[PDB]
């Protein structure tokens, strides 16, 4: 099969870290949990 299944893994690997860091960017800096 000719599809990306070994190049897309280091791409989703970055997408996930980005989204985790933004959800963390809310809580431990802007205190959405205190709201």
């Amino acid at each position: 099969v000719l599809m990306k299944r070994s190049i897309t893994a280091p791409l989703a690997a970055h997408i996930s870290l980005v989204n985790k860091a933004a959800v963390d960017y809310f809580f431990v800096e802007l205190h959405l949990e205190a709201h």
């Binding site: 897309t8 980005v18 989204n19």
Partner: protein, 161 residues
């Protein structure tokens, strides 16, 4: 038909379309280089013999092109599906070498709105295109990542604050 393939290729649209045409012109040279280095003049039958098993691989590309015609994503997806269509013939490496460079500009493009925060779209080849700052529009490619990049880039535009 070799002549009408060079007659088909001309360039100074789309970036991936330009890359596809330059990859085709990189094969026409090989076809011109192989003649006069194996077969100058031999038996009369040998020439028709040598360029039947070689000429048919060239003649598939006339069926492939318009020898209107797809551009943009409509090219980049259709040629993608020509990979899964043909993988088990003599026309597998030429289609493979064409797709490997018709996706060469797009892979760089995706690598921009994720890392540095630069959104690239100037030809209509980029998939995501069109208060709480998130009003962006969205209306083959693996759909597993299509909505993923849409949410991952709108996130990066918020971390840039």
């Amino acid at each position: 038909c070799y002549t009408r393939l060079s007659h088909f290729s001309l360039q100074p649209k789309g970036l991936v379309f330009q890359a596809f045409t330059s990859g085709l012109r990189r094969y026409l040279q090989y076809y011109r280089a192989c003649v006069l280095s194996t077969p100058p003049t031999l038996s009369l039958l040998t020439i028709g013999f040598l360029f039947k098993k070689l000429g048919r691989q060239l003649r598939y590309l006339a069926e492939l092109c318009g020898v209107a015609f797809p551009t943009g994503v409509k090219l980049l997806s259709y040629l993608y599906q020509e990979a899964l269509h043909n993988c088990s013939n003599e026309h597998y490496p030429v289609l493979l070498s064409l797709l490997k460079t018709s996706c060469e500009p797009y892979t760089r493009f995706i690598h921009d709105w994720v890392y540095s925060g630069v959104f690239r779209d100037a030809y209509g080849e980029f998939m995501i295109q069109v208060k709480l700052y998130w009003t962006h529009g969205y209306v083959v490619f693996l759909k597993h990542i299509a909505h993923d990049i849409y949410v991952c880039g709108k996130t990066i535009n918020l971390l840039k604050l």
